Design an enzyme around this catalytic site. Structure first.
Site, mmCIF file in Angstrom:
data_model
loop_
_atom_site.group_PDB
_atom_site.id
_atom_site.type_symbol
_atom_site.label_atom_id
_atom_site.label_comp_id
_atom_site.label_asym_id
_atom_site.label_seq_id
_atom_site.Cartn_x
_atom_site.Cartn_y
_atom_site.Cartn_z
ATOM 1 N N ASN A 1 44.496 42.892 41.221
ATOM 2 C CA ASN A 1 45.954 42.899 41.486
ATOM 3 C C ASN A 1 46.666 43.879 40.565
ATOM 4 O OD1 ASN A 1 45.891 41.032 43.608
ATOM 5 N ND2 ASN A 1 45.806 39.346 42.119
ATOM 6 N N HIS B 1 40.790 34.913 40.530
ATOM 7 C CA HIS B 1 41.264 33.591 40.970
ATOM 8 C C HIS B 1 40.590 32.464 40.190
ATOM 9 C CE1 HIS B 1 42.616 35.376 45.113
ATOM 10 N NE2 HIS B 1 43.318 35.855 44.085
ATOM 11 N N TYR C 1 37.057 41.400 45.264
ATOM 12 C CA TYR C 1 38.041 41.801 44.276
ATOM 13 C C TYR C 1 37.474 42.786 43.220
ATOM 14 C CZ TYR C 1 41.317 38.454 46.221
ATOM 15 O OH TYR C 1 42.152 37.819 47.088
HETATM 16 NA NA NA Z 1 40.681 29.617 42.048
#
Ligand code: NA
Length: 754
Positions: free
Chosen positions: A180, A230, A239
């Site tokens: 991100n 996450h 990711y």
């Molecule tokens: Na998570």
């Protein structure tokens, strides 16, 4: 830096994303890349809303739906890309240009502007749109007005005032991390090229530094090479790839300019190429066990993600020292060459084609995937290789969630962290060829499973819940690994199982013990659940063949081995019945992902399982898998005590590999497994060579300050290699006491002398 420096950066970005400077005339792969570009552009143009006073740009995309707003913008940036690519059908086409500009203007007026509050998924407003809008501004820089740049820059800045943070104000803004952070910084960096804002550019560049600092919790890169996003999900393959891709592009863009990435700790990211990415790349695909919810995506596959990783590594290699550049190139050439199933050039972009062609012209030879073990204790993942195969184990624990589901993706993946055994082989399409659309999500290969049906999104989205288990972990010594998982079943069934894997250079021994549940349903363990595609692959047994008829489950006679044509061998290590099912399964990608196509795929499977029955009391299993074994090698697996079970119960699980002269063990409780003991949880692998004992040991809870082994193979009086304190127990046995404080599941190697 001023106007000329900004112009040169913009031109470099357009070079990078179009490949305009590197197209080889008359090259068939370039022509194909251009055709693919042309077809996408034409498709978008056919969907243009032409209506007076329009309220969307594309007739099939609503600006009131945030995902469709993103797609509006990515179609516009694609069209701008085509418009900027020499020999594309729309190259320099002023009518097409006008349509792109009017699309950017109206999407701004109608929706994406500096007065608009976010609605729906934050990612759409802060990452999806900005990256695409910024690219379009740069691609169209010669064509947009100053007023247009002001408007679009203002919109981006409204949603992303600071790419070190994320979320709209009403939510409370948090530090952006990992993929991100890279994506937010990319959007701002590109936007800063369009608007010539060195202040924003510098801050966004500085923001990249956090993403490659080692972490010991949360999201990022761990010292053992694990990558989590996450918080609770192993994520190198999706990711982690997003991170890899964006840094490759940004590093390349900035290199040699006033804005160059100059942080020396970026060495950690370069180290991750081989320390994080390469071990989970399998013949061009990212392992499914490290790509989270993306398994549910028909068109974001392990090969799509692996191809992006290869593009990124090739691009980064250009700036490396000669030896590293050539090593990375060799890795990529191997992942390319071995992948005949989704060749990288099919549907490749012009940039990707150029990097692949550049690699080929270096003449750098392909590097083979090394045999042996790569353990990632921080993310409860292990990789194991031998000639013709790669095993990826998918565990879960009090650190690592059963699964990630979210945004309507992977809601049925609740058993994917229940001790899956992915055997990748020359069947390159095993897990790719509609496997996730058709597989039995309650009988995934390797798992132990309570047959109680679970609802979609059981345990919640975004990996919010993790199993309160004892431990999951691993160690390895030379050619043998020991992996353990205390499985706690999802959905509060009360399923408990002790699963271990003992993995040599050829065969995987799978032991299970202490199996029970509270639900009152039967519990199964899945020896395999294997995609046969449209094949009728023969299951051979001692007696003849089994499961010749689809849909009729049969129990294996008493020879204890089954060979699956085109795969290899399975053999039972106990007298438990092996149920064998040839089955045809159907399903659509829409059944596993809200965005999936409705098309029904139909696939053949071979399904091998043990049934522990209703109300098992200390149920157990013992079997082995021999990928690539011939029928003759398979028939011989159980002869000569080659795979010698030592113990398999609630205290410990252990096997000796006769040929390898190596013994492997997992310990659940203090006690002995043969002549090896442990004082608490442990993974151990040991092998004596004459008067020398070699050991590998992990403390898999990651929370114990010490661990004491009771040593096998007689007495031991000095430590040759490594650390540890030798002692003697009440029974005269030598002990080895280790300080395991802070070891985070990592392996200690010890060598003792008699
Ligand atoms: Na998570």
């Amino acid at each position: 830096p001023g106007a000329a420096e900004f112009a040169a950066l913009r031109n470099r970005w357009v070079d990078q994303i179009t490949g305009r400077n590197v197209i080889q005339a008359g090259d068939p792969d370039f022509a194909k890349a251009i055709t693919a570009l042309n077809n996408k552009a034409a498709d978008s143009l056919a969907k243009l809303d032409v209506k007076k006073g329009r309220t969307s740009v594309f007739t099939d995309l609503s600006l009131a739906k945030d995902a469709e707003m993103v797609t509006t913008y990515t179609r516009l940036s694609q069209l701008a890309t085509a418009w900027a690519t020499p020999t594309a059908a729309v190259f320099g086409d002023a009518a097409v240009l006008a349509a792109i500009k009017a699309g950017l203007a109206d999407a701004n007026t109608l929706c994406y502007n500096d007065r608009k509050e976010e609605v729906g998924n934050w990612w759409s407003w802060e990452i999806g749109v900005p990256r695409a809008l910024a690219d379009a501004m740069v691609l169209l820089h010669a064509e947009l007005s100053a007023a247009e740049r002001t408007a679009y820059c203002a919109a981006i800045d409204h949603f992303v005032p600071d790419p070190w943070l994320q979320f709209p104000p009403k939510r409370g803004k948090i530090t952006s991390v990992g993929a991100n952070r890279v994506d937010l910084c990319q959007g701002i960096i590109i936007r800063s090229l369009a608007g010539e804002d060195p202040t924003k550019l510098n801050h966004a560049v500085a923001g990249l530094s956090q993403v490659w600092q080692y972490v010991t919790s949360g999201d990022g890169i761990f010292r053992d090479g694990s990558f989590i996003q996450h918080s609770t999900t192993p994520y190198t393959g999706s990711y982690g790839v997003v991170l890899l891709t964006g840094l490759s592009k940004l590093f390349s863009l900035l290199g040699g300019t006033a804005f160059e990435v100059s942080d020396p700790t970026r060495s950690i990211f370069f180290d991750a190429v081989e320390g994080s990415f390469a071990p989970v790349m399998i013949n061009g695909a990212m392992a499914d066990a490290v790509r989270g919810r993306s398994i549910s995506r028909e068109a974001n596959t392990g090969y799509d993600l692996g191809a992006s990783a290869i593009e990124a590594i090739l691009l980064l290699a250009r700036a490396m020292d000669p030896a590293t550049a050539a090593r990375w190139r060799g890795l990529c050439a191997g992942w390319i060459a071995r992948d005949t199933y989704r060749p990288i050039l099919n549907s490749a972009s012009v940039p990707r084609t150029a990097l692949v062609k550049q690699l080929e012209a270096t003449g750098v030879a392909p590097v083979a995937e090394a045999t042996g073990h790569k353990l990632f204790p921080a993310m409860d993942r292990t990789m194991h290789r031998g000639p013709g195969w790669a095993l990826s184990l998918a565990l879960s624990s009090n650190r690592i969630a059963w699964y990630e589901c979210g945004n309507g993706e992977n809601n049925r993946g609740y058993h994917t962290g229940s001790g899956m055994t992915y055997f990748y082989t020359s069947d390159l399409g095993q897990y790719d060829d509609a496997f996730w659309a058709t597989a039995n999500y309650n009988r995934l290969p390797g798992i132990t499973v309570d047959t109680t049906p679970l609802p979609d999104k059981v345990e919640g989205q975004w990996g919010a819940a993790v199993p309160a288990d004892e431990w999951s972990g691993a160690t390895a010594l030379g050619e043998v690994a020991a992996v353990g998982q205390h499985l706690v079943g999802p959905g509060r069934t009360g399923l408990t199982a002790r699963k271990s894997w003992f993995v040599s250079g050829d065969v995987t021994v799978c032991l299970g013990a202490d199996i029970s549940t509270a639900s009152g349903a039967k519990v199964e363990t899945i020896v395999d659940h294997r995609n046969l595609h449209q094949g009728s692959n023969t299951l051979t047994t001692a007696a003849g063949t089994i499961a010749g008829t689809a849909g009729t489950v049969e129990v294996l006679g008493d020879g204890r081995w089954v060979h699956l044509e085109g795969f290899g061998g399975y053999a039972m290590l106990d007298d438990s019945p092996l149920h064998v099912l040839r089955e045809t399964r159907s399903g659509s990608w829409s059944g596993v992902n809200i965005n999936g196509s409705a098309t029904v795929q139909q696939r053949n499977f071979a399904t091998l399982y043990v049934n522990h029955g209703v109300g098992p009391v200390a149920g157990s299993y013992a079997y082995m898998v021999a990928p690539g074994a011939s029928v003759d090698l398979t028939r011989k697996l159980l002869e000569g005590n080659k795979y010698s079970v030592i113990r398999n119960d609630a205290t410990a699980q252990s096997v000796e590999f006769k040929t390898a002269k190596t013994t492997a063990a997992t310990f659940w409780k203090p006690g002995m497994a043969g002549d090896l003991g442990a004082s608490g949880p442990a993974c151990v692998v040991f092998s004596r060579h004459g008067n020398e004992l070699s050991l590998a040991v992990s403390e898999p809870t990651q929370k114990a300050a010490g661990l004491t082994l009771t040593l096998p193979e007689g007495t031991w009086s000095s430590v040759l290699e490594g650390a540890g304190t030798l002692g003697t127990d009440a029974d005269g046995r030598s002990t080895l006491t280790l300080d395991t404080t802070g070891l985070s599941g990592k392996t200690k190697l010890i060598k003792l002398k008699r």
